[PDB]
Structures are given as C-alpha cells and as structure tokens.
Design an enzyme around this catalytic site. Structure first.
Site, short mmCIF file in Angstrom:
data_model
loop_
_atom_site.label_atom_id
_atom_site.label_comp_id
_atom_site.label_asym_id
_atom_site.label_seq_id
_atom_site.Cartn_x
_atom_site.Cartn_y
_atom_site.Cartn_z
N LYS A 1 0.82 -1.22 0.00
CA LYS A 1 0.00 0.00 0.00
C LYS A 1 0.85 1.26 0.00
O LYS A 1 0.50 2.24 0.65
CB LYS A 1 -0.96 0.03 1.23
CG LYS A 1 -1.97 -1.06 1.21
CD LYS A 1 -2.78 -1.11 2.55
CE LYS A 1 -1.90 -1.58 3.66
NZ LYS A 1 -2.70 -1.89 4.83
N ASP B 1 -4.87 -6.29 10.44
CA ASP B 1 -6.22 -5.68 10.51
C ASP B 1 -7.37 -6.64 10.18
O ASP B 1 -8.41 -6.59 10.86
CB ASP B 1 -6.32 -4.38 9.69
CG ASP B 1 -5.87 -4.53 8.22
OD1 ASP B 1 -5.26 -5.54 7.87
OD2 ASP B 1 -6.20 -3.63 7.40
O1 LIG Z 1 -5.26 -3.32 5.03
C1 LIG Z 1 -5.67 -4.42 4.22
C2 LIG Z 1 -4.46 -5.21 3.76
O2 LIG Z 1 -3.68 -4.37 2.93
C3 LIG Z 1 -2.55 -5.01 2.36
O3 LIG Z 1 -2.99 -6.15 1.63
C4 LIG Z 1 -1.65 -5.60 3.45
O4 LIG Z 1 -0.60 -6.42 2.88
C5 LIG Z 1 -2.45 -6.49 4.38
O5 LIG Z 1 -1.63 -7.00 5.40
C6 LIG Z 1 -3.70 -5.78 4.95
O6 LIG Z 1 -4.56 -6.73 5.62
#
Ligand SMILES: OC[C@H]1O[C@H](O)[C@H](O)[C@@H](O)[C@@H]1O
Ligand SMILES: Cc1ccc(NC(=O)[C@H](COC(C)C)Oc2ncnc3c2cnn3-c2ncccc2Cl)nc1
Ligand code: NA
EC number: 2.7.1.1
Length: 443
Positions: free
Chosen positions: A154, A190
């Site tokens: 991200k 998360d």
């Molecule tokens: O925030 C949602 C997701 O974003 C990206 O995929 C991250 O790699 C992941 O760990 C998280 O759960």
C-alpha cells in the site's frame, strides 16, 4: 456510446471467469499452507498465533494502536463483566509523507508522539497498560507478540523495517521517547483484528476481511492444515495475504492495459496484483486511466482532458464513491468541476459508467476470493449448509454506495451452499487488537 460500452465491456467477468479465479485462489491457499510449497506460494497463508479458545479475557483497560494507512488510530478499550461489556475511546492521527518515506525510527517516533498525545488527552499518561498493535502489512509471526515485516504494501516505504521485528521497533520508539510505558502484548493484522472484534459480537464470525486501501482476508483454519505450526488440535487464524494472488501469473488472463499501468507506476511493481484490482489505493486511478482512454479516442469531453486528469492519482477513490452516490448529476458535476472539466450531460453518464465498471469488477474479483475461503472452510467441516459470519472493515466497502451490494450478491452466487452474515465493523481493526491483548494477558 456504441464504442464506449465495448471499451467498458473489457471489465466484465462472467460467472465462469469468477469460478476459475475462485478455484485458483483455493489451490494457492492450499499451496501456501503446505511446507513443501509454502516458500514459493504467492498466497502466503501466514500463521497469526490467534487460536480458537474458550470465550473471555482479562477485565481492565487495554490500549490499541492501528497502523495500516496514512491515517492511524489510538484507542482505549475497557473490558468489564456484569454479562461482558466493551467500551471504547479513540483519537485519529494523520502521518506526514516525511514520516512514512524516511526511516522506520522516524515513523515509530511519530507514532509514539501520538500515543503520548492520546494519553495526555485522556489524563492517563502515568498508567502502564497492555497494548495491542494492529499492523496492516505482511508479517511472519513467530508468536502473538513477535513478527517480522516481510514487505511494505500500500505504498509505505520507511527504511530499516523490512526483515525486522515490528514489535521491537515499537518498543524501541516508546523507550526512546521515555514519556510513558506500555506492555506490547500482541500484534495482529487488521483482518485478524476485525474478525476478533466481530467474534465478540457473533461467535460464528470466523473470517475477517478488509476492502480499504488494500484488500486482504483471514480465517480460522484447522491446526492439522496449518503445517507451519506443530499441532493438530483446534483452529488458528491464518492471514491469507490474498492481495499477492496473481504474483505468480495466476491472473494473467484477466489483466487489462489499465492494470499493467497501475502496477508499473506503483510503489511495488509486480506485487499485490490482486489487491491492485480492488483496493481503494488503486480503484480511483484505474478509473482515471479508463477516462483517459475514452478521451484519447475522442469519446469523452470532446477529446480534451484537464491538467489534473493527466495527473497520476487525482481521481481519488472517494470520487469513485461520490460519482456513484448520485440521478440529477449533481454529485457527478461536483466531482468533475473539482477536476477542471466541463462535462456534457452525457460525459457525466459516461464517467458514472466508468466508475461502475471498475468498482463492479473490484466487487466481483473480491467475491471470488471470499467465496474461495468460505467454500474451503465448508468443505473442511460437517456442513450441508454452512452458516458463517464475516467481519468486514475498510472504506471501499463501508463507503462505496453500491460496491457492497454488488459484492454480496456475487459472493452469494459463488457460495450457493452457505448462508453468510456480513458484519460491518464500526472500529474492529482497532478494537480487536485490544481484545486480543486481553485474551493474551489472561496468562
Ligand atoms: O489493510 C488491508 C491489507 O492491505 C494489504 O494487503 C496488506 O498487505 C495487508 O496485510 C492488509 O490486511
Ligand atoms: C495468544 C492468543 C490470544 C488470543 C487468542 N484467541 C482469540 O483471541 C480468539 C480467536 O477466536 C477466533 C475464532 C475469533 O478470540 C477470542 N477468544 C476469547 N475470547 C474472545 C475472543 C474474542 N472476543 N472474546 C471475548 N469474549 C467475551 C469477552 C471478552 C472477549 Cl475478548 N489466541 C491466542
Ligand atoms: Na499444524
């Protein structure tokens, strides 16, 4: 309009496409769970050390930190018995670019300053509490309170973090500041946090999903299937990291020109391709690129694009949501005028179609993912019809005016032998970290 609708039609996915994606996701999941193939799996299936266990936790106050985007959250969570009650207080913090693209220590110093601000504003800086950390990036966990960052996703970039114990980084920053003390007892994804918070409300909740800036899910796997961790008894949450699905070529037949372009100019070329089809980090930019295609064919705005529509990222995903919130074109006009454009009445309809085409493909791609997980779980049990609860957090899902509805209906067609209840987490990504900590402390 003829030619608009066939350029837009490239985004359609047939039932058969979605089943193919679903099944391939199930085979990648399976690869990621087995020792023989785990190391080469694109879908990592990371053990979280969060286990099925008798209900209950310590009673008391728990802090939660939630880092997963530019905006982050500190929370005080009070767990009490009557029977159980959970009450929360939060504050939000925005991280400047300087602090996200510099070193890990600068990032964790900024975080600790914010914790400090939170504790001041709640007159509790003299207290030493247990802290749970929701950390929303791929992590190899060695225990509930220990985990190595595999890689930033991200668009995060802080140096000195990848390959290191993220919990150590937090704790070192807290100590450097010396203004407060906390016991970091737990770090979770998360997805995982969302699931735990949801479970607390509904004991059939065994999947967590995020459709926010990124896209990921976790679920409760049987321990005999979690070959990376010794033991056959009970269940453990596995963080699929399904965002990286496609990173071994699994999606190649579905990727469009716009997809390659988003990937190539992204912070992480060739990675998180599945997530790039879906997440709010990228949906607005896909739309932007489709709108440009329709311009350079002179099918949109009479072939004139603004400066800001030629600018990477200027079609923010909140725009996609607002467009689709519109039928008097007021919402569409108000986003487009924002962008230095003068839509016809037809352009507004064209932009709303384009939004729809990207946002619908996202919901559809995402549904295949979740169906894959839910059907696998069904198959691993004694289920004629599996009733299951899914906790879901994220801004795309919560705020996008029709993504949700599209997602649900697509998910249901792919899971005709399950009945699924979706719980929209109000603040589960943050609350769950507190509740996991409470459970961990009960030791
Ligand atoms: O925030 C949602 C997701 O974003 C990206 O995929 C991250 O790699 C992941 O760990 C998280 O759960
Ligand atoms: C080290 C560690 C810590 C926690 C866990 N497990 C959990 O937290 C489990 C995971 O269960 C899955 C199926 C969601 O979740 C819980 N395990 C135990 N109690 C729990 C919860 C969630 N709420 N809750 C709860 N229920 C009632 C009152 C207070 C709380 Cl925190 N495992 C290992
Ligand atoms: Na095991």
């Amino acid at each position: 309009n003829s030619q608009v609708e066939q350029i837009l039609a490239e985004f359609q996915l047939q039932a058969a496409d979605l089943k193919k994606v679903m099944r391939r996701m199930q085979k990648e999941m399976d690869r990621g769970l087995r020792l023989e193939t785990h190391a080469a799996a694109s879908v990592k299936m990371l053990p979280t050390y969060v286990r099925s266990t008798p209900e209950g936790s310590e009673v008391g106050d728990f802090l939660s930190l939630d880092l997963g985007g530019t905006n982050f959250r500190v929370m005080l969570v009070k767990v009490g018995e009557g029977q159980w009650s959970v009450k929360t207080k939060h504050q939000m913090y925005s991280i400047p670019e300087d602090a996200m693209t510099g070193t890990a220590e600068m990032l964790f110093d900024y975080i600790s300053e914010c914790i400090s601000d939170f504790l001041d504003k709640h007159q509790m800086k003299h207290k030493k509490l247990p802290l749970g950390f929701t950390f929303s990036f791929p992590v190899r966990h060695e225990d509930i309170d220990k985990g190595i960052l595999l890689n930033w996703t991200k668009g995060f970039k802080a140096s000195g973090a990848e390959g290191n114990n993220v919990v150590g980084l937090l704790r070192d920053a807290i100590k450097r500041r010396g203004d407060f003390e906390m016991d970091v007892v737990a770090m979770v994804n998360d997805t995982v946090a969302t699931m735990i918070s949801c479970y607390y409300e509904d004991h059939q909740c065994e999947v967590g999903m995020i459709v926010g800036t990124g896209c990921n899910a976790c679920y409760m796997e049987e321990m005999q299937n979690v070959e990376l961790v010794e033991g056959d008894e009970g269940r453990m949450c596995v963080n699929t990291e399904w965002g990286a699905f496609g990173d071994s070529g699994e999606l190649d037949e579905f990727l469009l020109e716009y997809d390659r372009l988003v990937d190539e100019s992204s912070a992480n070329p060739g990675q998180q391709l599945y997530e790039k089809l879906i997440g709010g980090k990228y949906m607005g930019e896909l739309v932007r690129l489709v709108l440009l295609r329709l311009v350079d064919e002179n099918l949109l705005f009479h072939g004139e694009a603004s400066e800001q529509l030629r600018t990477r990222g200027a079609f923010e995903t909140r725009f996609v949501s607002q467009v689709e919130s519109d039928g008097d074109r007021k919402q569409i006009y108000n986003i487009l005028s924002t962008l230095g454009l003068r839509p016809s009445t037809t352009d507004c309809d064209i932009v709303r179609r384009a939004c729809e085409s990207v946002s619908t493909r996202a919901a559809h791609m995402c549904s295949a993912g979740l169906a894959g997980v839910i059907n696998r779980m069904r198959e691993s049990r004694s289920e004629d019809v599996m009733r299951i609860t899914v906790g879901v957090d994220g801004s795309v899902y919560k705020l996008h005016p029709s993504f949700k509805e599209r997602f649900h209906a697509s998910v249901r067609r792919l899971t005709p032998s399950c009945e699924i209840t979706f719980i929209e987490s109000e603040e589960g990504s943050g609350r769950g970290a507190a509740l996991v900590s409470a459970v961990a402390c009960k030791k």
